[PDB]
Amino acid sequence: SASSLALAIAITALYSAVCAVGLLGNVLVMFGIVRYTKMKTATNIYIFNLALADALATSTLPFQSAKYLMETWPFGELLCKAVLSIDYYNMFTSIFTLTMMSVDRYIAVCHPVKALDFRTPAKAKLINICIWVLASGVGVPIMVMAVTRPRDGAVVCMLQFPSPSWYWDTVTKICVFLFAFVVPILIITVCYGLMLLRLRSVRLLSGSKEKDRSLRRITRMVLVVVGAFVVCWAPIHIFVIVWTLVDIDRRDPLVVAALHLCIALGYANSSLNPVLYAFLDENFKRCFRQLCR
């Protein structure tokens, strides 16, 4: 169809734009961290691990965009196991690193004497190792259960759940909704919210309107971090709830365009994390001004 081909190349360009921004932005963050910043704080380790998870997450976007154009999986079962596991595994490692930086800034502000112990760079690597190990409890069963099946004359890269397959698929979708959206958004909002409530008393800068300006900058930075997580991950998570619980058409061009837009939104969080965490990093701005002057 003429409308279907225009919709296909629009979604592919949407996947390509998010992947190009996500790959270039995260590698540039990792290049600046390794060469210039040298990973000497706990926060610098967190941003590097966040950018590593985000770059690996956006690496599956060429595979998914080629799957939508060809309406099949042309990469074989071994790549169907690697790419789909990397999709789930790097979703968790990135979001848990997003969650942990909310905790890390909460510890930095609300428990400051306890932050001189807990926020050492040595404990940051241990926590980041624990993040990438705890997400292997999802990534590895996902890697086992990923199969290629013939479907409508084409090959689909899907998950072969144990019997009953309808039950274990819904349980996995609930566990992804709970432990990668709901539990992270509860921790991030509480940690940043308690941090902001403490920061309303912290004498950031001398003078009334110098202090309120810096406090507003942190509050706006919190709101764009929390707001980007909501508008990128809730649309894909509610859509999976709508796909599971509501008998939608599942073949409407409007529905599949609304689906892939929600998928590209979930990867746009990985694209925006260089902006919200490294472009807005005041240490990195100091390093950027030091490089320029």
Binding site: W243, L259, I263
Partner: peptide, 5 residues
């Protein structure tokens, strides 16, 4: 996420 259902 979401691409593989």
């Amino acid at each position: 996420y979401x691409g593989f259902x």
